[PDB]
Structures are given as C-alpha cells and as structure tokens.
Amino acid sequence: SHMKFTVEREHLLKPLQQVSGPLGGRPTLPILGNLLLQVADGTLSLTGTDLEMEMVARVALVQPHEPGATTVPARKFFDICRGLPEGAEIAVQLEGERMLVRSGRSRFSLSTLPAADFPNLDDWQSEVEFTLPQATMKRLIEATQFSMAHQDVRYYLNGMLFETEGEELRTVATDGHRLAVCSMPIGQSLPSHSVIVPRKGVIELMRMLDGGDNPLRVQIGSNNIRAHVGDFIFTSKLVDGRFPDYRRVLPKNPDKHLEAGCDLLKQAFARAAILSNEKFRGVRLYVSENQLKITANNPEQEEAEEILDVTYSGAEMEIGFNVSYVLDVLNALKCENVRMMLTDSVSSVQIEDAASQSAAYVVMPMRL
Template identity: 30%
Template sequence: MKVICNRGALLEALLLAGSAVVTRTPKPVIQCVKLEAKDNELTVSATDMELSIRCRDSQVQVEAPGETLVMAERLSAIVRESIDDTLSIEVEGESATIKGQDSKFKLFTQPTDAFPPIPDYEGDADFTVSGGLIRSLINQTIFAAAKASTRYAFHGVMFNAKGKHLTLVSTDAHRLALARGELTGPVAGKEMLKAIVPVKALQIVEKLVSNPEDPVQFQLRENQIIAHTPSATLTSTLIEGQFPPYEDVIPKESNRKMTASRADLLSAVRRTALMATEESKGIRMAFSKSGLVISGSSHDAGEAVVNFPCKFDGDDLEIGFNPSYFIDVLKVVNADEVTLELSAFNRPAVLKAGPDFLYVIMPVQLP
C-alpha cells in the first residue's frame, strides 16, 4: 500500500476516528486505526467494540492500493506534529513508513484480519435529517442525560421518528429536555421508530457534521443505529432498557407564566449562583407582578440578590431550583426569548423556547 495524503485532511479523519479508539485495553487491536486505500480514497476506521467510525478521505493520491493496521495514538501524533502539507504512507511487510520532506517514521503494523468487522451503510435510510438540525437537536438534549444512574436508559437520548418529525428526549429524573425537528422526508416503511442512543455516539455525530446543509442518514438495525454523512459513517449499539413515558412527566396545566430574555435570565442566574453551594441546595426565585427576585446564600461566603425585570402573569410564588439546571439549558436553546410556566412551589416548571423545545425542571426544597 502506498498513498500520498493532504496532512490536514488526514489529521481530521484520524481525530474523528480516534473518538472510538480505546487507549487502555488488553486488546491492542482496538488501540489501532485501520487504513484502507483504494479508488483514490483513504478510509480510516476505528472501533471500541460498541461504537465504530469509518471516515473517508478523498484528498489523497493512491499509488498502490492496500490496507494496514497501525497504532492510532502514534500515527495521530506524527501527523499532528508534522510541518508538511502532504505526507506519504507506504506499507511493506510488517511496518508502515510515514514520510515528509525532512522526516521519516516507521510504525509497526498488525494483521488486518484481527480487526473487528465494522458494519457498512447499505440500502436506504430509515429517516434523514439535515446536518445543522440534528446537531442542534443533540445539543439541546444531550446535557440533560444522566451522568450516573442505576437506570441505564437514562444514560442516553431517546430518538422518536414518526411521520416527518423527529423528537429527541433526555432525562436524569430531575429534569427533562425535549427538542423537535422536521425530517427531510417521512420515516421509511414504518409508522414510528424509537431507540435510546448513547451520549458518546451523539457527541461524535455532532462532530460528523462538517456542513450543516449535508444530510445525515440514519438506519436502525437490531440493537444498532447507523449515522451516515457524505464523509463518515458511525455505528453504535443502542441502550437497552425502558425509557420513561416522558409525555406523562410534562405538566399539562399551569397558572403562572414568566416571559424573559434568554441571555438576561442566564446572566442573572449565573450571578446568583456564585453564592449558592451544595449545602444551600439551590437558588430562590420570587415571582411577582413587579418582576423576579433571584437570591442565593452560603453560610461560609455570603448572599447574592439579583432583581430581574420580566413579564409575569399569575399569583406571587416563591420556588427553589438547582441553578446549574437553569444555566445548562439557557446556554443551548436557540431563542432570544423564553417562557417559564409554573403552578406551585412543589411542582415542576416548564421552560419553553419556541414551539419545538421544552424543558421540565423539578424544584428543590430550600431551608
């Protein structure tokens, strides 16, 4: 195998495929990337046995087709530190030689037949969504998935594709994020498709999208999801388990409503949170016709009070929230204005940003 590569494009492919590489494992083969050169294209593949990535680099000149398996970390470091615009990779016997204008590196290779098989993207998509939209939907939900929970289903994001619409939902039992978007066409062959996708896989799907106009095609197979773009394909196992009936969690009625600037509310909560601690458990929000007063205190540090002007309809209410849960959502919603619907001090609130995003947040009991 011999191929001449654009260094920047090769590095991009290696970094993306490297997202699936396991650095500590008793299986050296999954510390490697597989390089396949043919038809004027270099394919870079990696897997951790649960998640696989295949990146296609067309900015190459294939002088001799072939394939090889090399340590991902070493190859990425060589390409990253190189000062050349182009690099050549030539494989002979059990080693690969990487050459620049003034440098030459020799890496030992491993047998390619030891590399686990990676499923190909074949056939038609079950559903397709634009790259910019899927990146936005992931960004607006992934943060609310559980970091640690005995309920494994909470560690992922629920995909629900029905008709021409895609809904993503995540929860950690203290909050729930839901974002909707429109598919480029109806779901193929089935009335509805559901799957719980791991957070790690979705973080990489965000990276796959280099052009927001490019389509991202999805296929659901038994216990697997495949995401396919013009330059890369990701395959991931799905999370097994029962996702909660999230429709039942969303409050159907409220008798109080606040409307405010997203950026201004984010600033007010961040400033108040400077005095909130784990011990104090949260911040206090006091709603009235004159606006919102947000306060936080700490026995060790002191107290913060922020008077926040906003539109509020309904009776006065004092309620406590974890400030991090507000900060997380206000950083990612795509709206200049948000609404917060409330009913009682001990009932969940619903933050909405336009017709396609809502966020349920449970209150905390304050001292």
C-alpha cells in the same frame, strides 16, 4: 500485507481527526488505540472503534497504491501528519510488522497490530431510513445532550432517545432531575420508531456534523444506528432498553406563566450561584406581579439577592431550584426571551423560548 498509499496531508488530516473520535475513554485492549487502515478499489478507509461505536472515513486514492490492511497507533500517526508542513505528501507502506511513513526528509516507522484482530460490529439490517440536513441533526442533539445522564444505574438514561413521529424527528434526554426535548420537521413521512443512542456515540455524532447544506442519511436497525455524511460513516450499537415517556414530566395544567429576558435571567442566576451551597446549589425564586427575586444562601450565612422586572400576572409563589440545571437550560436557549410555566413549589417547571415551542425543558424543583 503489502498495503501502500501516497496522499496529501490536507486530504488526510480531517479524516484522521474524525476517525480518532471513538478513542476517548482510555481503552484497555491495545488495538483500540489503533486505527484500521484499508486500501481497496482505489479507496483508503480509516476506522476508529471503542467496541460500541465505529467511525469510518473514505479517502480517494489517485496516486499509485497497493491494496492491503493494517492497524496503526492513532495518536502517533495523527501527530506525525499534523506535525508535517502544509501541502506535504504522505507516503505510507508496510514492512513486516512496521508501518513506514515518508514525507520530504522525514521518516517514521510505526509499530502495527494485525488488521485481522481489529474488532468490528456485527452485520445488521436497516428498518427505518431517512435523510435530513446536518444542521437539523446537530440542532436536535445540541438542544438536549446536556440533559443526558452520565453514569446512571438506569443505563437507558446514559444516552439520547431518537424518535420518529409523522414528519418529525424528536430527541429526548433526561438524568431523572431534568429533561430536554426537541422536535424538528424533516419533510418526509416516517413510521413511528424510537431508539436510544449511547451518550458517547451521541457526542461523537454531534462532533461529526460540521458541514453545512450537505445531507445526512440515517439508517436505524433493531440494535444499531448509522449516519452517513460525505465521506464519513458513524455507526453505533443502540442501548437495549425502554426510555421513559417525556409527556409524563410535562406540567399538566400550568396556571403560572413567567416571561423574562434570557440574558438578564442568566446573569442574575450566575451571580446568585456564587453564594449558593457548593454541594446542593440551591436558589430560591420569589415570583410576584411583574417581579422575580432570586436568593442564594450558603452554610457561611452569605447571601445573594437579585431582583428582575419580568412579565408575570398570577398568584405569588416561592420555588427552589438547583441553579446549575437552570443555567444549563438558559445557556441552551439561544434566544431573547424565556417563558417559565409553573404550578406550585413541589411540581415540575417547563422552560422554553417565549417565541418558539421546538425545544421544551423540564426541571424538577428542590425542597432545598
């Protein structure tokens, strides 16, 4: 190969950072630490992969260039380009098994691995397609991602449900103790479809959405998902499993409704958490006419107690929660007031913005 290109540092830095996204997780196969570089039809393509997902960036080439392909260590190449001064011109050329980088009086010779060895995802067909604002996709992911399981044996929970229904796009995430669900209108009629995006890909897609107005084109296949925004393309294999129905966890007929200031609740739970058991993180909620009492105890017999003025008219009840799950929800709700819908001490609780029904959170209580 005789791949050759010359590009401005400023046009290369964001693409490098973006395609280096799937390179987390310390992969064993050495080429997985490399980026695939391809020159063809006046375009430089950069690809980063982890075998499950691919991140692609396209850079227009206006300066003399020669077609070809190679793979280069991602971290070293990024650090070199990042380390060069603002407005630097980066001249790249291949010499046998080495990639030469020239800028000003700086020269770098990098070891390569053949482009022919770079893993790629199998070709697939899109079956569902739609366009939506970047901010809408980001909101759907940010509102629910903290509720995804991390390394659960129920592999289908280590990710996020993306469901199309009517004119809405819905995201669902659960770890079996708590659930998050967000729905947004996308002003387009859609077929009923649901897919599971792996957690690693969900995170990388969310980090890819940084621009404003700019539309996101989504293509969903039987085993893959693709999202394109500007010069960036995110592709991932889907999790091949059946996701639980979120409707099963929603309180059937909640008879108890609590309303309180979001920040006031958040700060009271955060202080009470200090004296909660380090392992179980249990807090006790005492709900009575217009008052909430939060208590936390630990094995050292230390105790925290917080009393808040809230809006509540119902029967008095005591309920236990893992304070971290409650704090995660309150931190996700960027609002003034919070609503809590309860039934009894052993049943699920729904937490929402008192003013909006777009995102619902369900936390299962603890006996303690």
